[PDB]
């Protein structure tokens, strides 16, 4: 998870709903910008 | 490639004004020879031990 | 080749005890979801905030400090109205009006 | 297959018949009449009128007919968009994205428009569509976004260097290009440095497709293992040595160099929390430093530096 | 054209749409239960090709029924973005930056989504909006796999890009590579000689 | 930490649709080529009727 251990006992795949997606994200990217051209900061 | 470029430019260029100096682009030949001698499978460093 | 993502690294123990106390602030989004934003104590808490969802969210605490609306993007109406006058579009409107109503009465 | 969305689009836009200045005048008049009609409907909607049925119905007809004419003209000139956009492919953006941005420029050209000047639509629109395609190709082409003024001067440098490469035969020098463009050589160099295209970490550096550049890049920021443990040992040794100092001395050193919270306290704060004058703090500071410079407690910590 | 004439003369009595939202609705109005019972009936009483076609369909439908996963996962609304470090922008000394080619694909999708939003606000004719929705779909498909559903999306040197799938497929995916062998620290090698004394 | 993108219109996958066999194609009972005309904006669809 966010915090992990060596007690992992079941890896369960399954399609993800968008309801699960906008609760994973810690934000939202909206601009196609990588890094400033002059100062080289995000 | 040179011929292609030469003829395209010739068609665009106005007549009674142009010359092979203004037609020939020598970039393609240089590029080809360079990409051959460098960056090719069949031009290897002479192994000289 | 040797490269590295432009950045820096620190080597200090992550003391979990002696820190600067935080203060969780609530920021309701337009849909109404709550997104916790930990702030320090001596810290001017903003009324609005860009939340985790990505839409603007206001404090759950009652502030409502003015929407601060901006001027509208130039519209097609704006780009038309300058070159042409209202009364000038009037005659054209009446021409189309008579055209369509002549179709109607027919 | 028919997977080429280029075809899926061209065969679509080849449908609507192409128009002329006659139909253009009629269309523009209809569009303008409709926009005026909806403006007045909005005006009379507010605080306004219980409209007559025939009048209201047919002015709504005009309002919708204006949009019909607008869309008709847009469909008519999609072909023109393609004809103008074909010339900016082979580099940067892809053809389809360029067509969409040119379409946006065309919406702008038809929006911000006039017909009383008595000019065919393409004359004016061509300018807008070319501008829109160029704007897009400037902004949303290079990964690291470089703004448009810088982009235009980049293109001017590229043209000058290329043309003078052919003219001179030899590649131009930074001062030759600086004098030509009436700029400074360091600016020539800066622009050239900004023309560098980020290589891809995804490239088969080996002949067979197994060796990638990303697998040979030492990250010169990683934990050095020995450096971290060495820093821990330094912390311990320094703590012991400082504990050799007297209580006042240990306190002044720790506060002066922020060993207790990471905040470096200065002389006035230290004198305030001890209730003395800053001159006394500075004297205790100098005395303690000199004491630590003594080889007894110094040579232990020399190696860390 | 027929659809237009049908709507504007019969605007009531039905709803009909085009594209990913209409199929969202289709899945919304799809009942796995009833379809599954019908498929059981077919495989139980049908014969020949119908029974087998029901079988393969019967498989995936019950698969969704037993997972209780509501196939909506096929219509992908809000799309998640992989963490920045897994797609590094390393700067090789000299200023030459190094993308990871997932940056470029993500940028394509984001550009097309922004432009689609813009066109929707303007109210462009159905041609442009539908073309841009098509391009969104195409680029999302490209990012989740490049080379499927058409020719590969390429770049410099006409090299195909590296969609997320090409990081998790074939021989160069994680699932057939560094999850097999790992360079290890505290290691060395050397040429060997015979010791008839040990 | 991950992000997300709030799309302005819905979109579909490429794995559960085009990959043989079309899982969606079975699901909604349509052939793959037929759906490749519905989810790439080249054919309408009636959603309900009385």
Curated annotation (Swiss-Prot), chain A:
Protein name according to UniProt: DNA-directed RNA polymerase subunit beta'
Function: DNA-dependent RNA polymerase catalyzes the transcription of DNA into RNA using the four ribonucleoside triphosphates as substrates.
Family classification: Belongs to the RNA polymerase beta' chain family.
Subunit and partners: The RNAP catalytic core consists of 2 alpha, 1 beta, 1 beta' and 1 omega subunit. When a sigma factor is associated with the core the holoenzyme is formed, which can initiate transcription.
Leader sequence segment: none
Native organism: Mycobacterium bovis (strain ATCC BAA-935 / AF2122/97)
Residue window of the full protein shown: 1 to 41 of 1316
From Swiss-Prot, chain B:
Quaternary organization: The RNAP catalytic core consists of 2 alpha, 1 beta, 1 beta' and 1 omega subunit. When a sigma factor is associated with the core the holoenzyme is formed, which can initiate transcription.
Coiled-coil intervals: none
Function statement: DNA-dependent RNA polymerase catalyzes the transcription of DNA into RNA using the four ribonucleoside triphosphates as substrates.
Part of the intact protein present: 394 to 442 of 1177
Name of this protein: DNA-directed RNA polymerase subunit beta
Disulfide-bonded cysteines: none
Family from the record: Belongs to the RNA polymerase beta chain family.
Swiss-Prot record, chain C:
Gene3D superfamilies noted in UniProt: RNA polymerase-binding protein A (2.20.28.270)
GO biological process: positive regulation of DNA-templated transcription
Assigned keywords, A-Z: Transcription, Transcription regulation
MF terms (GO), sorted A to Z: bacterial-type RNA polymerase core enzyme binding
A matching Pfam family: RbpA
Assembly behavior: Forms a complex with the RNAP catalytic core and with free principal sigma factors.
Function: Binds to RNA polymerase (RNAP), stimulating transcription from principal, but not alternative sigma factor promoters.
Protein name in UniProt: RNA polymerase-binding protein RbpA
Gene from which this protein is expressed: rbpA
Swiss-Prot record, chain F:
Function: DNA-dependent RNA polymerase catalyzes the transcription of DNA into RNA using the four ribonucleoside triphosphates as substrates.
Top-level taxon of the source organism: Bacteria
Family assignment from sequence similarity: Belongs to the RNA polymerase beta' chain family.
Subunit-level organization: The RNAP catalytic core consists of 2 alpha, 1 beta, 1 beta' and 1 omega subunit. When a sigma factor is associated with the core the holoenzyme is formed, which can initiate transcription.
Name recorded for this polypeptide: DNA-directed RNA polymerase subunit beta'
Originating organism: Mycobacterium bovis (strain ATCC BAA-935 / AF2122/97)
